Amino acid sequence: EAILNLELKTAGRINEVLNTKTKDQNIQSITLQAEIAQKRLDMKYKQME
Amino acid sequence: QQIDQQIEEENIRQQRKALQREIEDDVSKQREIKGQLLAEEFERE
């Protein structure tokens, strides 16, 4: 029983890490696309002015 | 000795984590830089 909870401690650790790296990158995705949307403002506004 | 070493086997299983933190740093760099760059896009225009 203690052995099995070692394996499923490991599974837990892995899943924590997977969401950490997955959502880091998925939040970055969208975030930087939002930065592109932000780019639309600032980029065109230089010449708009 | 086997008990002692089942314990040590786990002590050794207990660096990857520090690298995971380092990986978050790698994202921070590049994330900030792309937004830096949109700010530069306005400057560059």
Helices (H), B1-45: 2-13, 16-44
Residues of A in contact with B27 (CB under 8 A): 24-25, 28
C-alpha–C-alpha distance, residues B45 and B1, integer Å: 71
Q: Which two structure tokens, joined as six digits, stand for B3?
A: 């008990």
Residues A23, B20, A14, CA angle at the centre, nearest 5°? 70
Q: How was this structure determined?
A: cryo-EM
Q: What is the chain B residue with the closest CA to A17?
A: B20
Cβ neighbourhood burial of A16 (10 Å; 0-12, 13-18, 19+): exposed
Whether the CB of A36 is below 8 Å from some CB of chain B: the reply is: yes
- The number of C-beta contacts closer than 8 angstroms across A and B is 39
User: What are the φ/ψ torsions at residue A2 (nearest 5 degrees)?
Assistant: -75, -30
Q: Which helix (H) or strand (E) holds A46?
A: helix A4-48
Cβ neighbourhood burial of A12 (10 Å; 0-12, 13-18, 19+): exposed
Cα–Cα distances in Å, from A18 out to A21, A25, B29?
Answer: 5, 11, 20
Resolution (A): 3.8
